[PDB]
C-alpha cells in the first residue's frame, strides 16, 4: 500500500515498520 511512503514521511523521526499492507509505526 500507498501508506508506507506516507507514514514515514508524517513520521518522519518515527520507525513504520513496513511489511506489506502491515504498517506499523513507533515513536
Keep these: 500500500n500507498d501508506?508506507?511512503?506516507?507514514?514515514?514521511?508524517?513520521?518522519?523521526?518515527?520507525e513504520v515498520r513496513c511489511d506489506x499492507?502491515?504498517?506499523e509505526v513507533h515513536c
Design 21 to 23: 499492507p502491515r504498517y
Design 3 to 14: 501508506k508506507c511512503k506516507e507514514l514515514k514521511k508524517r513520521y518522519p523521526n518515527c
